[PDB]
Symmetry: C3
Subunit: 271 residues, 3 copies
């Protein structure tokens, strides 16, 4: 399916099943296919699942402009409104945690029943003057420099730390192949702009606007988005939030811990 | 090109050349590209060739519902009507033998000039009470469990028995790469539902409704769809049907035996 | 974005940034993604960059007909008119040098500010009676024969001589993977028809009609499109043209010499 954003950007999405809606927001630099197992799992169990390809990624158009969290949040708003979704459970992975949080911050939670933040960059990822514990911005500056030389090999190399393959985690060649195939669909511009967006966007104000039941899940072996300064803090800043730590789990735990995640999502939905 | 099915599903297809039409229905889990060489071969020799991506596959939309043979058959009917095809020669490979047969069964053969079944699941694939010779259903249950864990590696591993590489057939890494790239475009849901469909759908009633010239081709080295209980039987059950057996040929013989197939299709069309 | 050509062919394109427009025409058998680094480079420096997927390639439709230079040039004219571009700088790589040249020849230069030809097939690639120094047509005949057997492995094998990896150039597996992934998107029919087109089309008449500032860049290590009978000659045939030779550069120098190319394009635009 597709809808056209306000600025003309065609956005690809899938809308599967029927029942209470669950809307998924993917991480960088992937697309809606990263959710395929959670979607099949939940839609076979009485839920409607929706996942979109973020602008610049997967099967969506690749705009030069609007590659920022306010626009991402507003894209999500358009999708929710054009489908007239109610009592939606928002589920964001990695950078996708930011745009579902920013959606609520900008649009409020009238249409929202719950929020799930998976290995999310929330509430803040890169260093700020009052957040020296964040990742130094020159780390991301170097990522961008490498991406602007050879994004294909960069993402290929990223497979290891992403899935924790370098820490013995076990992920097939097929999954690594699929990851790269998907990432190569994306815009170079969007791929690089997103790094700027997730490195420097502060979602701490957003955390105070979240007034729905929230589940934060994070692996404490996460090499990409450090649990201690993200998920752990998000769970404390969101009132009533529940925290689940997957022991030793990597960033890419929707793959490595698929069954556990499926069951935790179902449990949250049935709470 | 695209058309919109009854339920709103957008289906991609290619329509090449001019003259008598030949419509191709691909196997699992591929798309219209698996036919590219047959299409160029025939269309450069004065035929019109048409091939679609089955719903849930390749460049087509990925609906949650309708992943069954009655819907596949009606998708074909809609394409045929959409182009107003007449004297069409229907060519199906593997599971694709099922929807061309079911199309005839449901819509009759007024628009049909001939039928070709290549390594097809017809007339029946999985076991039934009166068909213990069929493939046991727990075989397919197990395929589905593996697909629901890691479809990417499952399909990568499938390359060997599919192409008979483990039995002396020679197939390039490029072809294996292209096969996987195509497979990964598909919906997880369609990929799994199709297994249920070809595992359990009985086309024996369909055979009795086929009243056009018919050619069945099958490899007797086929490790995927056993010649003895499918192609061999389909050729007996369809009145007037011709049978060609490619000795020691694998399931993926449109690759390994491309030139032989091209020539056999041309010979059939010029009968 | 897309537009629809005269014959119904839907053509994918990207349109990034704002300012004076630079329109990119890709080589065989790639798509607009081959330009992604040049586009980001120039659009972040005040230019508007546009690149299309040639008919039959990338995300464009795959027509059986019209795979020739006159149609390609007319496709470009349609895009320029669609966007109503003025003072456009045309940049063609490899076979893409041909359709921007043929555009000017068929439609004039009223809308054109400048022309860049990179490793281009211009002014003539294959042998003619008065051009025995061109590549013998039997060389292309054998290529087409191999393409019609196994295009996937053909393109895979082509990576080495294309990027000069066999002569000491260094290009990542990631880039080689992306090259093949893009190539596989293309039509088999378009892939083969383009060989016919670039092998036999004479652009020498076109060179005489080029009345805008022109820059020709070519690597003298080019194993694919021989510098001495293409780029070297186009620079002399085009009045006022400038020639830059990248020492020992391969055909795929937009990859191996990316920064150099980026700086040369910027310098040309600011000339």
């Amino acid at each position: 399916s597709t809808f056209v954003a306000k600025d003309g950007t065609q956005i690809y999405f899938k809308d599967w099943g029927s029942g209470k809606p669950v809307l998924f927001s993917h991480g960088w630099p992937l697309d809606a296919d990263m959710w395929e197992y959670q979607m099949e799992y939940l839609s076979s169990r009485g839920y409607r699942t929706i996942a979109f390809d973020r602008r610049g990624f997967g099967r969506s158009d690749q705009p030069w402009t609007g590659n920022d969290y306010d626009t991402f949040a507003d894209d999500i708003a358009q999708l929710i409104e054009h489908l007239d979704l109610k009592e939606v459970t928002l589920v964001g992975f990695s950078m996708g945690g930011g745009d579902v949080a920013r959606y609520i911050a900008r649009h409020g939670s009238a249409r929202v029943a719950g929020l799930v933040l998976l290995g999310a960059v929330t509430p803040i990822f890169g260093q700020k003057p009052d957040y020296p514990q964040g990742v130094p911005l020159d780390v991301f500056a170097r990522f961008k420099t490498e991406l602007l030389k050879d994004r294909a090999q960069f993402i290929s190399d990223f497979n290891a730390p992403f899935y924790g393959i370098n820490k013995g985690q076990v992920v097939s060649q097929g999954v690594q192949t699929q990851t790269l195939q998907i990432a190569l669909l994306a815009s170079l511009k969007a791929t690089v702009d997103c790094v700027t967006a997730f490195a420097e966007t502060d979602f701490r104000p957003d955390m105070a606007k979240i007034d729905v039941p929230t589940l934060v899940i994070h692996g404490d072996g996460d090499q990409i988005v450090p649990f201690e300064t993200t998920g752990k803090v998000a769970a404390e800043l969101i009132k009533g939030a529940e925290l689940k730590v997957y022991k030793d789990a990597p960033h890419g735990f929707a793959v490595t811990h698929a069954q556990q995640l499926n069951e935790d999502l179902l449990a949250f939905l049935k709470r």
